[PDB]
Design an enzyme around this catalytic site. Structure first.
Site, mmCIF file in Angstrom:
data_model
loop_
_atom_site.group_PDB
_atom_site.id
_atom_site.type_symbol
_atom_site.label_atom_id
_atom_site.label_comp_id
_atom_site.label_asym_id
_atom_site.label_seq_id
_atom_site.Cartn_x
_atom_site.Cartn_y
_atom_site.Cartn_z
ATOM 1 N N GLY A 155 -23.117 12.733 -15.787
ATOM 2 C CA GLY A 155 -21.800 12.187 -15.509
ATOM 3 C C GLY A 155 -20.692 12.552 -16.491
ATOM 4 O O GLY A 155 -19.506 12.389 -16.178
ATOM 5 N N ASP A 156 -21.063 13.007 -17.677
ATOM 6 C CA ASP A 156 -20.074 13.463 -18.678
ATOM 7 C C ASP A 156 -20.646 14.616 -19.454
ATOM 8 O O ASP A 156 -20.691 14.609 -20.699
ATOM 9 C CB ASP A 156 -19.689 12.295 -19.584
ATOM 10 C CG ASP A 156 -18.445 12.570 -20.419
ATOM 11 O OD1 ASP A 156 -17.679 13.490 -20.077
ATOM 12 O OD2 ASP A 156 -18.279 11.823 -21.414
#
Length: 301
Positions: free
Chosen positions: A199-200
């Site tokens: 996600g990041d």
């Protein structure tokens, strides 16, 4: 680079001490984290430890949920994730990492930044392989760990909602907006499955060993089940189209599920990063990162 006051030092020693960590010698404090204050200290056995002290209740409240995710990931992945030896609303703590990240960014004009070379085949191949392994984690394990789960329909709706939110809150370059809207309307681009995503994920969150092989990943607070392309956008950002093409070949060969418009989709996800950045800026309250977000959205691509 400044001294920690006697009172602050005493307080930090006492925080560590109530969790069983006996500190000795001077403290180094890093204030560049938005969500946690960072203290680097030497502990009883001579080993430096990192203390991460939540700054706000919303950060404290996520420690236990995030520790549960990390515990699941440790047992499902072939590379390392953070090992929080103390994991408390008050304190996250662990021994100082000996590996660094594939991108190292330091404050100051003269201090050395570092980024793995475009032509490091060892990094490129090990990253693609590691990413396939992450995306192969069963969704049932994500459910077990209390994670956010989006269907493909929900994945695409989240992007739409975020675009709507940014429109309501910011002035946006017309061509930027139209790009995101056309992407949202392009059925061919969108996947018909979701996977466990970091996600990041960019090089600054990838740990490497001294041969440039991926040894781990860090900063899992945005992990969820969602569009796999989320985790490749920053690879395109740093390594370009050729770097992305190579990633995709190795990823598929390692078992990763692809689709014909995946490379296109990843490029659109990267362009959508300006929306994410802006919403995270808006919610942080931080005035600087907010100013930056405003300028980016207003500007032509």
């Amino acid at each position: 680079m400044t001294v920690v006051t006697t009172a602050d030092t005493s307080q930090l020693y006492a925080l560590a001490a109530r969790h069983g960590l006996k500190l000795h010698g001077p403290l180094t404090v890093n204030e560049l984290g938005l969500d946690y204050r960072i203290v680097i200290a030497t502990v009883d056995d001579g080993r430096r430890w990192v203390l991460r002290i939540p700054r706000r209740a919303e950060v404290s409240a996520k420690v236990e949920p995030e520790a549960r995710v990390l515990a699941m990931l440790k047992n499902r992945l072939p590379f390392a994730v953070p090992d929080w030896r103390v994991a408390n609303a008050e304190l996250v703590a662990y021994p100082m990492l000996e590996d660094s990240t594939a991108m190292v960014i330091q404050p100051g004009s003269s201090t050395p930044d570092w980024v793995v070379p475009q032509d490091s085949e060892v990094f490129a191949e090990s990253f693609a392989t590691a990413l396939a392994a992450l995306h192969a984690v069963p969704i049932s394990a994500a459910v077990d760990a209390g994670m956010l789960i989006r269907t493909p329909t929900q994945a695409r709706q989240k992007v739409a909602d975020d675009v709507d939110r940014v429109r309501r809150e910011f002035v946006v370059n017309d061509k930027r907006l139209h790009r995101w809207q056309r992407w949202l309307d392009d059925d061919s681009s969108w996947p018909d499955f979701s996977v466990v995503v970091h996600g990041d994920l960019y090089v600054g969150h990838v740990l490497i060993d001294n041969t440039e092989r991926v040894s781990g990943m860090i900063d899992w607070s945005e992990a969820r089940v969602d569009d796999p392309a989320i985790d490749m956008a920053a690879h395109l950002m740093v390594f370009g189209e050729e770097g992305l093409a190579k990633l995709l070949l190795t990823y598929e060969a390692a078992g990763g599920r692809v689709w014909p418009r995946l490379a296109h989709h990843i490029a659109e996800r990267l362009a959508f990063g300006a929306v994410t950045y802006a919403l995270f800026a808006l919610d942080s309250g931080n005035e600087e990162y907010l100013a930056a977000a405003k300028a980016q959205l207003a500007a032509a691509e």
